[model samples]
Target chain A: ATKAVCVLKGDGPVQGIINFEQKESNGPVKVWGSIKGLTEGLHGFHVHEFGDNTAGCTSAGPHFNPLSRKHGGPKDEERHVGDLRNVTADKDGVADVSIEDSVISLSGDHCIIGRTLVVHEKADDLGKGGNEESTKTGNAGSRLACGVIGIAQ
Target chain B: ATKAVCVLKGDGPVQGIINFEQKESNGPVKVWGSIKGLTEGLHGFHVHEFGDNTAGCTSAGPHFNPLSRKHGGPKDEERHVGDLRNVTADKDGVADVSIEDSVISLSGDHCIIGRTLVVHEKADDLGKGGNEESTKTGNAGSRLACGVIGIAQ
Candidate 1:
């Protein structure tokens, strides 16, 4: 009794070298998912603008922040348009993530119909006016995990 | 030549989708890879525990921490047994993730293998005493991205 799709790959896993897709979501823009295989310690996780999923899920663009807001927490006073917040993994590299797209709307033309997820080496601090530049993000560090979301055809 | 393998996934173009098979890593493990489809901002990324990439790569375990310390920075002195250090990702969500496989060894035996990658909701403080739990893993946020490492025949 759900209305969703499983985004597919166009460039092929070899063209851009990625394998990302979604099983289901609350709406067209909002989504909830998780990942595993970690360093047996702590790792960063978040959403990106890119949907290439093939570009190692790197070409998805930024955090889909159309508002041009600074990097803040999920429930911050002022945040980005595409800011879905962050997530972490357990010692078993096991992590579960769930989020709702505020700006993204599946009902109207405005939606995150296609987007990508990104893994980082650092984290986001919601730019609490501490690092000044950090106001954008916590500067996670690297891109370890990646993926894309699409409407399953 | 080399020896390694990786896991990857993403959602970009319509015909998009990519995946690697034991590409090659010169470490104990034998794979290295990641998913695609990303935003234009920074993302979290790292290695986890298990070798299971199911449930959105949830089969993988957690980080490999032996020190049993706090969640300091990746390169902190008082780190946990998990922290395998840190990695860097770009705007394209495209990054290179290699493996050593503590479980698979070159000489005798390895410690762990077939881990995964995970994304975070925020960044780690590195525990410079700047964050509330700076001593820990900087209190990074939730999990955003993730995946597991697969070995091809």
Candidate 2:
């Protein structure tokens, strides 16, 4: 079994912790966490290629796409491995995340261990947006927060 | 100015937080923090290439060496940018760290945001060890704890 964790923060007041678990190598990864201090709406969430937050979230680089796939919905086979879809925040500005993903693994070449988790300021169109940027970033807006995934006990 | 932070944890009882600051782009980075639950002695501390803690600290990869420099002391110009030398832990198992480094920057090409800050089990020889690994990792022992560097307020 493998487990990873991240403590999320931003230049603003956003804060949260996310946990990932895998029962076996190459098995489905289970993600669960709670984020606070977000606007009441769906926020785009994804794993980014770089963990560099030196310039704040802007330095996280693009979405994690080792396969060079196009951005799409979590259930879409054509989506980037980093795409996990949007997380909805409640009126209290909190989002409880629960997701099971197969494309992302805990170990192997496609492993996302050293990558970054980013929360966007707007909902992701899941590549359905009419703009060309849809196929690249799902037209997600500015980054709201981010954190690096690390080994956990 | 640029500011970054990390929350460190290990499989064992180690825990801590580190903060980094740079007054300007490509300027010297100032590091400060406190770590607890370490053996009383000097411990190897450095930034690693990966923030991935998937397989504990092993997945964090080698030290951050974008310049392909040999391992050396923090003050050695030939050392890796991730090299910040050792932190001394008191008899009470606590280490208060304060260091100013010119190689590691908070922004620009050598930015370390999103990288992993690692604490080792033993003191680093600072490449003075006669062993071959000395020129690589300063013969630092097993990883004790690690965390990802991230953007901060």
Candidate 3:
């Protein structure tokens, strides 16, 4: 645990592999993992903005913020630049999410790399939200679990 | 290992000892937490919406949802609704995160008491994004680590 390159994927939780990491970003840290131990409903998925290892996934930080702002929706005009879009998991306890954040730059220039990841309590509205006061975050509130975004070899 | 929480402060990173739980009266499931490793920068944070966390906190889902949307900011009239306020990491790598969802209730209906969490690479702009038409997921970019939320005690 000496400041390494880590990664977390699916299937680890099922076989008693809570946190998994594969430090070795060959090309942008493309991980091929899966989340196990799911219920039989929808699961909200997300990526915070920190890297805390979150032994229980609580070491990571909030969403990215190359610009720094408040919590916006999946589609916002004025909020945290790191506020990402929303995701949904099928009823089979199987959800797949993947993206390349421009804010997660390893060059140590932008917002900084290695943050946290989290799941939600409900499904993201995906827009068609409620009052005009809400943003794209889908009214998808809450921080489930978290982990650190480190580097591995 | 079991589930862990993580976080990302401003100047550095964080690893909180306590975890928070956020849930809407009727939402999915989510668990909140804090971090300890920053430099006092008023860290911008939030939940992206996706990542596949199988290895405890290695491979989280996506950026919550990398799909771009409208400008609709958090509490917007036309947004994902998953949007929420932002979590600030103190100057000492210490910040508190609360989880709130619509699917998971505490009243035995929708309670996101035990779920997962993930962080990002950059700070959330809240909304004040960088582009003119990239509302979905803030434009924050990239993802980081991930972890599952659990009920301790």
Candidate 4:
């Protein structure tokens, strides 16, 4: 099995841990963990192109779209490989996440190691929002927290 | 500069990200990041002896005590190198952590890379709990979350 983990941090109190695991080389990646210090709602989450945090989340680059696909939800067939469903926080501002994704591989050409896992301020429209920005960012607002993905035991 | 990061996870909703950086090989390590889903109080945080998490936090071993010193707070002169201060969470159950310590190194024989960063359910008594457990685990209760420390950019 292969596993990776990221420690997300932001300018504010938003922070959390995210873990990715794959049972086999070609298996779906199980994404799980918890994030805190969010408002009581949904927040955009995805894998960005770079792991760099020299300039904070901005230097992490765009979504990891090697295929150059449009921004869409985790369930969309024609979506960026980095696109993921929004993480929803409860009234206490905690998001306990559990996701299974086949698109984000842990060991192969589509591997996400050394990239950035990002959280946004607002909910992702999943490319369904009417505006042009929706297609580019799911209408998700600014970046909230981000961390570089690294190998885990 | 040397930098590392850890993504902490537990049996429940507790999760968070921790980053460590040293401006020089022998400089103090700057520990920062955010952890979420904790109760509104203090929690014990430390670098355990091993990175192995196959058996959950149990297999991670004890505090990284290269000098074999007694369990003390971060400020104690006769403390374990892994002994760190407690992390406090706000009413929203989030801890925005910032710490600097000279005892823990990122490079050389005392390096902590590949170890486990463990969070405890209760506060570390800093070897002052006056019980046998206090001298060992600081009476920190159960392990809440832990992650293997890894290199980071």
From the highest TM-score down, the ranking of the candidates is: 2, 4, 1, 3
Model 4 spans with C-alpha error above 4 angstroms? B1-153
Where is the poorest 10-residue window by lDDT in model 1 chain B?
A: B10-19
State the lDDT of candidate 3 residue by residue for B1-153, as single tens digits.
Answer: 122333322223444443533433343435465655543443333333322233433343333322344434445554433344445666665556665433323223222122234444555565667675346555544433333332232
Better by lDDT, candidate 4 or 2: 2
CAPRI verdict on model 2? incorrect
Instruction: Tell me the tens digit of each residue's lDDT in model 4 across A1-153.
Output: 987777788899899988888999878999999999999999999888766565678777888888888988888888988997789999999999999999898766677766788999999999999988888888788899987665565
Choose 1 or 4, whichever is better by TM-score.
4
lDDT of 1 by residue, B6-123 (tens): 3343222111122322223434333344434443333334444443333443433444444455655444566543444333344665444443332232111222223444554455
- For each candidate, the DockQ is 0.02, 0.14, 0.06, 0.05
lDDT tens string, model 2, A1-153? 988787677886788878889999879999998999999999999998766555667877888888798999999999999998599899999999999999888677667765779988899999999988999998889888888876554
Top-DockQ candidate index: 2
Ranking the candidates on lDDT from highest down gives 2, 4, 1, 3
At residue B87, candidate 4 shows an lDDT of 97
- In angstroms, the error of model 1 at A53 is 4.6
Interface RMSD, prediction 2? 6.5
Candidate 3: interface RMSD equals 10.3
TM-score of 3: 0.36
Q: List ranges where model 3 is wrong by over 4 Å.
A: A1-153, B1-13, B17-32, B48-51, B54-58, B63-74, B98-116, B132-134, B141-145, B151-153
Worst 10-residue lDDT window, candidate 4 chain B:
B50-59
Off by over 4 Å in 2: B1-153
